[PDB]
Amino acid sequence: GEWEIIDIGPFTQNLGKFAVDEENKIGQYGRLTFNKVIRPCMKKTIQVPAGYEYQLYVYASDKLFRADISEDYKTRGRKLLRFNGPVPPP
């Protein structure tokens, strides 16, 4: 799966911040500085493992990236699935 747009408040901004920290631990992009998550943010319910997947547009160091994140309900664990950029603005 079910798909839903969510707004860009503190919860979403910390998803954006999470993707940038993870990327900085991987190191395939230059060192990034989190700027902001912008609309639109898609949330997809995941049945197994129970949780959610978020698709985000996040500015970091004034470049625009796409980030995919998984969140497991059982532990509040976050995994960075995808991080590409720069992308065109939505």
Residue 85 phi/psi, 5-degree rounding, is 175, 170
For the chain, how many structural domains are there in total? 1
Residues sharing a CB contact under 8 Å with residue 90, sequence separation 6 or more, in sequence order: 38, 39, 40, 57
The resolution, in angstroms to one decimal, equals: 2.5
Q: Which domain holds residue 15?
A: 1-90
Query: Which long-range CB contacts under 8 A does 64-68 form with residues at least 24 apart?
Result: 64/88, 64/89, 65/19, 67/15, 67/16, 67/19
Tell me the technique behind this structure: X-ray
Question: Residue-wise over 54-67: b if at least 16 C-beta within 10 A, else e?
Answer: bbbbbbbeeebbbb
Half-sphere exposure of 44 (CA within 13 A, CB side): 12
- DSSP SS3 for 49: coil
